Amino acid sequence: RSPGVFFDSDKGKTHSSGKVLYNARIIPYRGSWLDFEFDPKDNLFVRID
Amino acid sequence: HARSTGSYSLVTQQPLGGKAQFGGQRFGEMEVWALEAYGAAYTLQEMLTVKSDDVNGRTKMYKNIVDGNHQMEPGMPESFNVLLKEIRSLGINIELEDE
């Protein structure tokens, strides 16, 4: 996967309600992964590595 | 490839695997199911006791074949003893209680 920023969905397989979450991953060539994820309550959370 | 008798593995006294080393074919789990589907109980018993990992059993069976008698003493597989010891290496006391 090319380094950069990529937005994916995890299209409804979680929460058993069909809601399509959204995640944004910043993949560096050499470094730590940074992900911005949503949840069913539509609150933006972040996780490092 | 073909093997009648060859070197056996160390941890479990079973035939070695492959043909680079003079190994035996694997009688897999599905093969055991297939033999169970038949009435082949003696064939299966000799397949997994006397032909694989019963050191006394296989030595005696070889000597009997050379002597011209086709009969086997079943015995107990060595891999079962290995399993027993491995379970005993935990805090689990598994034993074969008397008759």
Binding site: - | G39, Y42, G68
Partner: protein, 83 residues
Amino acid sequence: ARVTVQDAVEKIGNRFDLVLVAARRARQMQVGGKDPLVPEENDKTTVIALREIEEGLINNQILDVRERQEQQEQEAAELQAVT
């Protein structure tokens, strides 16, 4: 030689007791002491035993009767030689 054991199976209608009966009869002919009851045709003991079963002159009852007779004869011979 032998192709199918169907008639032998009909003679011992279980398909599993046939195996045990034939194994006993072949073992009695391989160690063996005993001799075949059917004209041997360059067959191995298993095939000869199965053919004996096919002819109707071997089964569990016959083998048990013969074993008991042999045991009684051996006991009688031992007793006579001793007392």
